[PDB]
Amino acid sequence: SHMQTLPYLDPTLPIERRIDDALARMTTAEKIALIHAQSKFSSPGVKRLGIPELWMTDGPHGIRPEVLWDEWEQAGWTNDSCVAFPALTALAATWNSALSQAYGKALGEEARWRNKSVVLGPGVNIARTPLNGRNFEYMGEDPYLAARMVVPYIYGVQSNGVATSLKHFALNNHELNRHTTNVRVSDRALREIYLPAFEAAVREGKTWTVMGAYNLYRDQHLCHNQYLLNDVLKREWNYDGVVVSDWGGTHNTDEAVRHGLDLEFGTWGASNAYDSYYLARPYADAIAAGRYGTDELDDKVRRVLRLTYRTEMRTDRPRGAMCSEEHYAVARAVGNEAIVLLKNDKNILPLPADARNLLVVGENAIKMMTVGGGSSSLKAQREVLPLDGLRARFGADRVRFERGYVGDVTGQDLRDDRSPERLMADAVAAARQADYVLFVGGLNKSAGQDCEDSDRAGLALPYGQDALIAALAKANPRTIVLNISGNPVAMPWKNDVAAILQVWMLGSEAGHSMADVISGDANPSGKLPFTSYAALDQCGAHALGAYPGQKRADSEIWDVDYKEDIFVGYRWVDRQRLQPNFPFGHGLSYTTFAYGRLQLKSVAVPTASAPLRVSVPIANTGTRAGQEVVQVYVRELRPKVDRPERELKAFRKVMLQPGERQILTFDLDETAFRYYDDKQQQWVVNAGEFEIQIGSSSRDIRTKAKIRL
Amino acid sequence: QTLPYLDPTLPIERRIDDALARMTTAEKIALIHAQSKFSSPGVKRLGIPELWMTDGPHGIRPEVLWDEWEQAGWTNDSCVAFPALTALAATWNSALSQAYGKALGEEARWRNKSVVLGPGVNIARTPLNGRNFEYMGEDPYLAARMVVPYIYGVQSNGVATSLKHFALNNHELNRHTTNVRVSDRALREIYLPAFEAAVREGKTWTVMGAYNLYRDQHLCHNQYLLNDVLKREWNYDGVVVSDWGGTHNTDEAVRHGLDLEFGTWTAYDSYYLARPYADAIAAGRYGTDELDDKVRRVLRLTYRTEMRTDRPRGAMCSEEHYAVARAVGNEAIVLLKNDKNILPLPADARNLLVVGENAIKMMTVGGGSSSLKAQREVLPLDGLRARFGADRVRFERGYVGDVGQDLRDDRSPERLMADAVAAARQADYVLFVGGLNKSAGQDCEDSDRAGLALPYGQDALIAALAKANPRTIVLNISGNPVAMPWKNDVAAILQVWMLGSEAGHSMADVISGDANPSGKLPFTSYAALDQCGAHALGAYPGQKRADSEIWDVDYKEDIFVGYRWVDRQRLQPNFPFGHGLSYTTFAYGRLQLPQSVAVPTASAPLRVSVPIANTGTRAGQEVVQVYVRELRPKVDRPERELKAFRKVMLQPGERQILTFDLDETAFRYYDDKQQQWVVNAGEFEIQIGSSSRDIRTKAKIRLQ
């Protein structure tokens, strides 16, 4: 009565041996049921063999509350209150890879507590246009910044045994017509802008799940695209994970079988007909009819089983926790380093230790940012509002509030029975008798702002915020603007206000992270992950007239042309000599930093083992202590093809004390100087003079040298 | 430095002391009561996982809504429906009971459930109790010997058992307002032995208090049985959870030893161990020591279950789990009558007629807490047609009882019987499959039976089929004994119970002959209702108090419950306790006693031996039952009591020797004057036979 342990249930055997044995014991019906969903966020697994279910959870910034089995409606559970972490556009603004791993590790522990197999995150779609409503959960517009910040995120989550989901593996750069948009982008712009983030997340980040987007590429949906899923991801990058479809992205059985769709979810309105999925009975009837064999099926099952063995089949996974002191400290520490100090004229910030009589104006000062937005919705255990955070730090009796404007509306009765002009009248009337005016405005998570399935109508702030800020700055020159947005906003009032900060959507500890910066308890160290355009025409996608695309005559497909090519974001404004309000990598601090000349004659092409060392002295020459993101840019003098004026190829964040001096050394390999030749279809470095630019921003270059390769 | 409560290399109690020192008073209050219908919140901050209770001593209940009894609509909770616990006890096989629990625990680990609300071992003192089907008969020794392996099987997977209804919940009428008045002798000899064995030997991690009252105290917070008996005398270290709705007092729930509260009527902040408890602690009326004891036990339950990692992952609807339910059913079916060896049917048996609603009616869905979404349930008609395909099996409805299953039949009760007897004339055999169901008034949890007779007029249907054909066979699906006025008219009678998923397949294995019936009756099948001691003395429902709403039931039959009553009164039931035929025969040799022996102990038992031989042509299993009788006792004692049994399989012609080690627990009684278990010196008659009345060998012995 003592049989030997079955190979797929034997922990002492290698993982690939157990997957092979489990595959041989599954029936064809069990193999097909494994590759598609049984509920809204779950797959059945193999209940007969003991292979557990895979439970997908939403939120790259937190754990979505439990929903009903089939509907999007909340299940009504009282144990799914999570810790809302700052948005990925804020995490990327930290430029701190060490925090990105602590961000992911804290999120993975919360996913383990909720018994969730895969976290639907992170998203690393390049911010092609400032109107994309989903850019708030991405990592900016630079392919190098997003790449070096997605790898620690994936390492953190997967360290707890929970898989990460590379969201929208595609060209999903705008939400308008996202289900019928066919992107026509050049191969050069594909390999240098939109792919580097996803490649470093696969080959280096070792992500176990890669999600395809709703859009199309080369007349094929990305949830079953032969060019990017098979030829690029699984073959070229040697990807051994699962390609999960976005909830609704699958549309063809024949393509889902042969183009590499391993796991199907949310297939269509309603999605409760799980037998009618494109990888369910239509796949089963086609195998029974002899149209397909079991090769593509066994490959999809071998990958989904590999995802199951990396997660639910494990035993040494941490149980995790939720709403713990450590998880709140991580979200607090990320927000303190995510806030970007844009403007600080006459050193008005930080506020002095005797800051009495302060006026707070704006809806975002009292409006929650964790609930709403569709997939980004989160039931936070508690959300510290900017007004409440500034009250606990400066005293409740020393802080007063005026509504200012009304936008839209967790049980918060944000209604205000005052007209828009009357709200402005008594708000500027209190600004005349106020020492400081802290304006907390920006966007929100409603349709058309920082929300999925929709895009912005323009760059200007909605609800007429341009007039309210200009009136507050006219009645009080000490007006401080706190902008909550995942996209850049127009600022026709930057010369009238004293201080401007990009505070993003920080989540739970939002008010406490803003108060730490306003008071001076935390030195601002965030750098912008995109270009803050002064107008919408400064964006290359809108300057060349190619943002929504063109609908086909006898079809419902939209053909959009990425005519800006590799010149996206700061690569466009540097070539066109345009001057934005604040450029990529911009970030001020409460203490000036000093740069030295590069230590570093004529050397050959560097490699990964033998890199080109570049040293730079960094010194703190102020009175306060803070962090500084030392950015490194590389420029090619005479390239064969068109290249931007500079490209970010290295960066490092270092904490310094007042009077401290350190020597930062960078190892530059062939990736810092190479470019993708679309003819030969390969990367190649061309010999010549290269200029190494190092400074506090993409335009605040402090030291520049030259070297020939 | 890993925190001590998260370090697996430390003893469990040291991890509990460290976890307790890190919890706040609010976290301690939230831990000991529920947050949903079947879950407690645990300690979300410290990482202490939640505890998920699940219904089903025979399976895993489908998922319900967070704060509702309605089904949640999940499509992954289809489980294996194992036979009722009254069928498992009918096997008398301790090995099957452990495999029964091992398979159920694996399905509990699959659904990610911490505690299985089971097993229930409430003594069936009356044939009218609604939920006797999920209990283990009327004898305390049979229940105590079948509950321990069941608990070993479930808790081997890291899923705790819930010893259901630690009380005297022997009937469901007025179950919430019933105060049981029972003597100490009947309490110690009948109603408590099954629970003590499950606690001391089975090592159950959770004990559930019932809805009724004892000494004017609800058993979910009873100082006499939860504190004095359970936690003190028996040294119980587990959790005393409450039945869903059994807690009714805040003061008693704190002092009388209630560890986990669930289903309190109202929301969750208003539980008797919630805000009323948190306010009384802050006001200074209650201390935190009694609170820490509750947290100490709930954490001990969590550290034995969800806190571990080495537990098996489990599975659902596997070949092993179906094979276990198949084996339990084959050995649970009790062959009552088999006149002229009509069974088993020949290999070329054809022209078979099946009659009855229970032949096409599912027995796994319905019944409230016993409801299950079985992935498959082989109906008796499906099992008999799979064994005899083509046109070898015909079917007629016969009768209608109640009712995704379309059980509609637009025919009068006279027309249904007329069509059944017309087909019974032109049939070689008549396989009637009747009994009860899971509706209210039969084998249901919130009601009792109206009587002992078969409902829906099945007596007139069985008599009409037996008259039209002498080869009529009756299959009774019930958890309680049924009246049989047609006993002398039917060729073969089988007690097949509720077998669950592999129900129809187990019946076909017995009817066709692919398996030898080895089941024995776990209760006394009374011929009439007044043959039960609880009903003869007129003390089944109790007496309604004048002012209060509490009912007072007085156990007047005392220890004489079940076969202990019909033996003293010399009554003749239809089939006695431990009755069960077989397709083969068994012969018993002379009982071998040692050469005025002293009172045995656990280290020096009284060894008895009896030769057993299969004197037939077919292989089969026999349940050899040992009974002890005291000729001249001090207090009243029954004519014989079950004290040992062993189930042995014998090939045709094979003879073995069965040696039983009888210690002091086979000859002792409980005297209410001394409040102890004492052994009286004198002559004891050791009786061994195939039933409680089919004594094949006997021998007297004197103890000193």
- Ordered by where they begin, the domains of chain A are 28-69+77-309 (3.20.20.300), 329-532 (3.40.50.1700), 591-709 (2.60.40.10)
Subunit contact A69:B72, Cβ cutoff 8 A? yes
Give dist(CA A197, CA A194) in Å, integer.
Answer: 7
Task: Decide: residue B674, CB within 10 A, 0-12 exposed, 13-18 middle, 19+ buried.
Answer: exposed
Which residues from A are below 8 Å from B72, CB to CB? 68-69
**Closest-CA distance of chain B to residue A37, Å:** 11
Coil, strand or helix: which one is A551? strand
B676-678 and B669-671 strand pairing:
antiparallel
Q: How far apart are CA A102 and CA A463, in angstroms?
A: 37
Q: Is B36 on the interface with A (CB under 8 A)?
A: yes
- Under the phi-then-psi rule, with left for phi > 0, alpha for psi from -120 to 50, and beta for the rest, what region is B175? alpha
Tell me how many degrees the CA angle A296-A297-A300 measures, rounded to the nearest 5. Answer: 85
CB contact under 8 A, A79 and B35: yes
Q: Do B112 and A113 touch (CB under 8 A)?
A: no
- Residue A73 at interface with chain B, using a CB cutoff of 8 Å: no
Of A269, A278, A290, A426, the closest CA to residue A361 belongs to A426
For the four alpha carbons of A223, A224, A227 and A231, in that order, the dihedral sign comes to: positive
Q: Which of A509, A542, A525, A515 shows the shortest CA–CA distance to A440?
A: A515
Cα separation, A30 vs A24, whole angstroms:
11
Q: Which two tokens stand for residue B551?
A: 């009912």
Residues of chain A neighbouring B5 (CB-CB closer than 8 A) = none
Task: Write out the two tokens for B96.
Answer: 């099957």
Under a CB-based contact definition with an 8 Å cutoff, are residues B286 and B19 in contact?
Answer: no
A475 touches chain B (CB under 8 A): no
B218 - beta bridge partners? B213
Measure the CA–CA gap between A433 and A446, rounded to whole angstroms: 34
Rg (CA), chain B: 26
Token duo for residue A255: 């393509």
Number of residues that this document lists for chain B? 704
Residue A549 near residue A591, CB atoms below 8 Å: no
In this structure, the number of other CB atoms found within 10 A of the CB of residue A276 comes to 13
First-to-last C-alpha distance (Å) of chain A: 72
Q: Are the CB atoms for A421 and A404 separated by under 8 Å?
A: no
Residues 98-137 of B with CB under 8 A from A: 106, 110, 112
CB B561 within 8 A of CB B534: yes
Nearest to B195 by CA among B269, B233, B143: B143
Instruction: Sheet containing A358-361: give its strands across.
Output: A340-344, A499-502, A479-484, A436-442, A358-361, A399-402
Which of B111, B313, B501 would you mutate first to test chain A, the one with the most A CBs within 10 A?
B313
DSSP state of A257: H
Catalytic residues of B: 243
Helix axes A15-25, A295-309, angle to 10 degrees: 130
Q: Does B26 touch chain A (CB under 8 A)?
A: no
Query: What is the CB neighbour count within 10 angstroms for residue B119?
Result: 31
Place of tokens 């009873």: B222
| Residue B140 zone, left/alpha/beta (φ > 0; ψ -120 to 50; rest) | alpha
Long-range interactions of A552-559: CB distance < 8 A, separation 24+:
A556/A180, A557/A180, A557/A181, A557/A182, A557/A216, A557/A219, A558/A177, A558/A180, A558/A181, A558/A182, A559/A182, A559/A184
Inter-chain touch A115–B110, beta carbons under 8 Å? no
Candidate from B66, B309, B310 with C-beta closest to A76: B66
Residue of chain B with shortest Cα separation from A274: B75
Q: Smallest Cα–Cα separation from B159: which of B103, B109, B195?
A: B109
Q: How far apart are CA A291 and CA A282, in angstroms?
A: 11
Residues 6+ apart with CB under 8 A from A450: A133, A134, A135, A136, A373, A443, A444, A485, A486, A487, A505
Quick check: A50 and B75 CB within 8 A? no
Exposure of A611 by Cβ count < 10 A (0-12 exposed, 13-18 middle, 19+ buried)? Answer: middle
CA of B501: how far to CAs of A175, A452, B79, B494, in Å? Answer: 51, 47, 9, 19
3-state secondary structure string across A693-706: EEECCCCCEEEEEE
Say how far apart CA B488 and CA A566 lie, in whole Å: 96
Residue from B3, B35, B75 whose CB has the most chain A CBs within 10 Å, to mutate:
B75
DSSP state of A677: E
Contact A52 B316 (CB under 8 A): no
* Technique of determination: X-ray
- B551 close to B541: Cβ distance less than 8 angstroms: yes
Residues linked to residue B25 through DSSP beta bridges, in sequence order: none
Q: Which two tokens stand for residue A509?
A: 């500890």
Three-state DSSP class for residue B614:
strand
Which backbone phi and psi does A244 adopt, to 5 degrees?
-85, 135
Alpha-carbon A424 to chain mean position: 35
- Which of A46, A37, A650, A103 is CA-nearest to residue A312? A46
Residue A70 contacts B where some CB pair is shorter than 8 Å: yes
CA-to-CA dists, residue B397 to A253, B354, B386, B394, B432, angstroms = 47, 8, 19, 10, 10
In this structure, how many other beta carbons lie within 10 angstroms of the beta carbon of residue B68? Answer: 11
- At position A102, the amino acid (one-letter code) is A
> Does B315 contact A47 at a Cβ distance shorter than 8 Å?
yes
CA gap B556, B509 in Å, rounded? 43
In whole angstroms, give the CA distance from residue B149 to residue B147.
6
- Give the total residue count for chain A: 709
Neighbour tally for B93: CB within 10 Å: 24
Half-sphere exposure (CA, 13 Å, Cβ side) for B309? Answer: 13
Rounded distance, CA A572 to CA B556, Å? Answer: 96
Partner residue facing A75 (CB), from B41, B66, B75? B66
- In this structure, are strands B393-396 and B352-355 parallel, antiparallel, or unpaired? parallel
Q: Where are the beta strands (DSSP E) in A161-239?
A: 163-166, 181-184, 209-212, 216-217
Is residue B484 within 8 Å of residue B572, measured between CB atoms? no
Please name the residue of chain A whose CA is at the shortest distance from the CA of residue B313: A50
- CA A234 to CA B211: how far, in whole Å? 61
Q: Is B598 exposed, middle or buried (0-12, 13-18, 19+ CB in 10 A)?
A: exposed
Nearest chain B residue to A328 by CA: give it: B45
| B52 shares contact with chain A (CB less than 8 Å) | no
Resolution (A): 2.6
Q: Is the peptide bond before B344 cis (omega within 30 degrees of 0)?
A: yes
Q: Does residue A38 sit at the B interface (CB-CB below 8 Å)?
A: yes
How far apart CA B317 and CA A85 sit, in angstroms, is 40
Q: What is the DSSP letter of A228?
A: I
Helix, strand, or coil (residue A526): strand
Q: Are A491 and A536 in contact (CB under 8 A)?
A: no
**What gap in Å lies between CA A106 and CA A83, rounded to an integer?**
9
Residue B82 carries which DSSP code?
A: P
Tokens found for residue B186: 């009947």
Residue B108 main-chain phi, psi, to 5 deg: -75, -40
Radius of gyration of chain A (CA): 26
Residues 315-354 of B with CB under 8 A from A: 315-319
Identify how many contiguous H helices and E strands chain B contains and give both numbers.
17, 25
B602-605, long-range: CB < 8 A, 24+ apart: B602/B663, B602/B664, B605/B661, B605/B662, B605/B663
For residue A236, the SS3 value is helix
**Which of the 8 DSSP states describes residue B597?**
B
| Chain B: closest CA distance from residue A107 (Å) | 14
Q: Give yes or no for A11 touching B (CB within 8 A).
A: no
Contact state of A44 with B74 under an 8 Å Cβ cutoff: no
Strands B160-163 and B206-209: parallel
By DSSP bridging, strand A682-684 and strand A675-677 are antiparallel
A191 token code pair: 């390999």
8 Å CB contact between B622 and B518:
yes
**Cα gap B618→B585, rounded to integer Å:** 9
* A50: contact with B, CB 8 A cutoff: yes
The pair of three-digit structure tokens given for residue B324, joined into one six-digit string: 């276990």
Q: How far is the C-alpha of B201 from the C-alpha of A302, rounded, in Å?
A: 46
Is-contact A569 A141, C-beta < 8 A? Answer: yes
Contact B313 A50 (CB under 8 A): yes
Task: Select from A47, A69, A323 the Cβ nearest to the Cβ of B73.
Answer: A69
Mutation target among B2, B6, B45 for the A interface, most CBs of A within 10 A = B45
Kindly identify which residue of chain B lies nearest to residue A46, measuring between CA atoms: B315
Parallel/antiparallel/unpaired status of strands B606-614 and B655-662: antiparallel
Element holding B395 (H helix, E strand): strand B393-396
**Nearest-angstrom CA–CA distance, B380 and B358:** 8
**Nearest CA among B25, B148, B134, B28 for reference residue B81:** B134
| DSSP-derived 3-state class of residue A632 | strand
Q: From CA B183, how far away is CA A54, in angstroms rounded?
A: 55
Given a contact cutoff of 8 angstroms between Cβ atoms, the answer to whether A112 and A317 are in contact is yes
Closest by Cβ to B313, choosing from A52, A70, A76: A52
Q: Does B74 touch chain A (CB under 8 A)?
A: yes
Give the E-state strand segments of A365-406 in sequence order.
399-402
CA A31 to chain centre: 34
For A691, the enclosing helix (H) or strand (E) is strand A689-695
A327-337 burial, b if ≥16 CB within 10 A, otherwise e? bbebbbbbbbb
Instruction: Determine the residue of chain A that is closest to B74 in CA distance.
Output: A69
Please report the DSSP string for B88-105 in residue order: HHHHT-HHHHHHHHHHHH
**Which residue from A36, A6, A53, A120 is spatially nearest to A308, judged by alpha carbons?**
A53
For residue A704, the cross-strand partners are: A693
Mutating which of B2, B5, B66, B157 best tests the A interface, going by the most A Cβ atoms within 10 A? B66
- B46, B112, B319 ranked by CB distance to A115: nearest: B112
Q: What is the rounded CA–CA span in Å between residue A156 and residue A150?
A: 10
- Using the beta-carbon criterion (under 8 Å), do A39 and B75 form an inter-chain contact? yes
- Identify the residue among A3, A40, A47 best suited for mutation to test binding to B, counting B beta carbons within 10 A and taking the highest: A47
Contact B318 A68 (CB under 8 A): no
CA–CA gap between residue B312 and residue A233 (Å, rounded):
36
Residues of A in contact with B9 (CB under 8 A): none
Q: Answer positive or negative: Cα dihedral of B512, B514, B517, B519.
A: negative
Q: Residue A420, preceding bond cis, omega within 30 degrees?
A: no
Q: Which residue of chain B has the CA closest to A313?
A: B313
Reported for B183-186, long-range contacts at CB under 8 A and 24+ positions apart, including other chains, are B183/B555, B183/B558, B183/B672, B184/B670, B184/B672, B184/B675, B185/B558, B185/B559, B185/B635, B185/B669, B185/B670, B185/B671, B185/B672, B186/B555, B186/B557, B186/B558, B186/B559, B186/B561
Q: Which residues pair with A132 in a beta bridge?
A: A455
